[model samples]
Target: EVETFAFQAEIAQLMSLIINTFYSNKEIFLRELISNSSDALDKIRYESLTDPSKLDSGKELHINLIPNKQDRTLTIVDTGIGMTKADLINNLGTIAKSGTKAFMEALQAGADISMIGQFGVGFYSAYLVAEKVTVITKHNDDEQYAWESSAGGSFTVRTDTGEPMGRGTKVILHLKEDQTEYLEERRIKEIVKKHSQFIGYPITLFVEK
Candidate 1:
């Protein structure tokens, strides 16, 4: 069953706030994505403890990133738990149903500031520097799907007929004007170490000359 969704009025406003507010600290985008990848991997691994069929036991879990400088794209791939179509809709489009509403409500009620990105909407932070974003993902029960959006108040999810991710998500960021700084290996390594050194999964950066 294919479907399309227009970003909710409230969600659109929230995304606008995030894009403009996080522009200065745009480097945090990678950090947030890697952290989510780690979380996804952990979720699947934990589920496997009870349902060993969730994944082949003893498989190495990790994240890989490729910077396509020539194409002005940065692709981050994870071998973690991928999202189902429902997960994509809830996680991305309807913030009120996801942790987004809780996170914001807590904030409006004077909650802890450190829990800002506790919600799933953190992924949308990619728009801080990306004009377009593509997500190809595969789940234990799902074939493979792609989610694409420009943060332009709408998005679509269709079966992605590309290289399978095995059991994870791949996020490709089409960098915007002046956003090419992310394609630099040295800078990416610096940010990964600085912001994600504590991540439990092994994150490998693809080196392409």
Candidate 2:
């Protein structure tokens, strides 16, 4: 069964701000997302220190970027700490309720901070170039789920039973008509080199053969 939730008031405003006001530098969405994946990988690593079984015996911690030309979509997959259903809601749905206020405060005070802030609003930047964003995630303690939205007033999360993911998250961006350049393998590599070159995990791009 699929569950639907309306976007929190602040989240709706943030979505509009990112989609409408941000006219350029849309490539940061890749930077933001890959940073998030790196953070998740870091979390699982920390957790595994206390509970070794969380590692699940040798799954490589890495990220994958896949561009589908025929389908006109881009997917970012990571072997990291996946989110639970509630996480999909609280983390993605309620933006302003989190550390966003502190982030802004820090920004105003000229404190240097990373783009991968605790606010988690960076995920919405995907809407700057994507008509829709779908996240399929699996946490070690919960069943797999898929969350989807089109930067609309609401989003849906449903149980995903197609392919079992081995404890990670996958974000698929349904590109807008004019935003197809992001699907180019070379273009993606450039973005990765420009923004995510220092990321610790291996980021593999699916090159066309």
Candidate 3:
């Protein structure tokens, strides 16, 4: 079962705005992504505090950063509260239209850069460095699903047929040709140390054994 979705009018405009103009400090893309993963991890823990059954076999809570230079991609995998199909559509496909409208207006008015962080637009920041983004996620309540988008007007979601992701999410960033720095271990480590040093879960980057 595969489904395609068009981004909302305002959201579509915001996507390109984010990719082309919003972020001058592109390294913060990693910070936003890592922070999102950390937030998802915390969500599951908090949910399980009252409903222990939500814990998926007590899987260890952690995040994995896999940078594949050969593939020109960087993957971030997290054992966290994964999204269902609806979650994908709602969360990624459409942000609050009112908020987006105001965001656009703010930008036109030359609002301070700090306002960028106020909205739930961090995920779109991935477009700054990635040509495409693939999200493979498995939720306890739903089957595995793959969501792919190029930050264009539309995105597609399909029943994932690849390896099962167990119970979390995997975000694969197909890096733009010149964005090779993200595929380097040294740079990734530096960004993590600077921005996500206080993240509670273990953030392990793939390295030589």
Candidate 4:
């Protein structure tokens, strides 16, 4: 069944706080996304161990990065569990399920900020540097789809046209001019090592010659 979802008002406020205050380091966005991707890969891998059928389709889980200087776009792709159209809307648009309110409450109560994973809202950090974000994903149980957003208040999702990968996800970040530092190879690698080196999956950067 098709459905639509909107972010709770509290979620919108949380997003604004993240964009303005929470993350003092801008480069941390890459780490947040990579860490998320690693978690996805690990989850799928663990599930596959018990249900080999899960590996019948896309089993290899890896992360790849592509940077285009001319277009000023950076794409991070992974082969993991992908989201459906409804999942995209609900996951990306609204903060209702993300525990954003609880996180805020914890902060207000003077709790340790690091303990705030009560909300799994880190994925939205992509907007800190990206002017536009596109997610192309394929799931073991669903057809390939693409979700695009401008980080404003609206987003769009449609079927993907390219050949479908077994099962995975790809995130393309069209970065703003001020965020160009992310395109640098050395800087990108350093960020990955600092934030995601201990992550459970393999992460590779697709370098331009």
- Per-residue lDDT of model 2, residues 1-209, tens digit only: 88988887666666665666636678888998999899989988889989989988336899999999888899999989999887988754554556555555664676433442456656777887898999999999899899998876788999998788889999999999999999997889999999899999999999754
What is the lDDT of every predicted structure here? 0.80, 0.82, 0.84, 0.74
Off by over 4 Å in 2: 91-96, 99-119
Better of 1 and 2 by TM-score: 2
Q: Global lDDT for candidate 1?
A: 0.80
Pairs that collide in candidate 1 are none
**Two-way lDDT contest, 1 vs 2, winner:** 2
The numbered model that scores best in TM-score is 3
Q: What is the descending TM-score order?
A: 3, 2, 1, 4
87 Cα displacement, candidate 1 (Å) = 1.1
Per-prediction TM-score to the true structure, in the order listed: 0.87, 0.89, 0.91, 0.84
What would the per-residue lDDT of candidate 3 be over residues 1-209, giving only the tens digit for each residue? 67988889887887788777745677878887888899889999998999888885456889999998888889999989999988898855455576677767787888743355456667777888899999999889998999999977999999999988788899999999988899888999999999889999999999732
Ranking by lDDT: 3, 2, 1, 4
lDDT for 205 (candidate 3): 93
lDDT winner? 3
Can you give the lDDT of residue 170 in candidate 4? 86
lDDT: worst 10-residue window of model 2 = 110-119
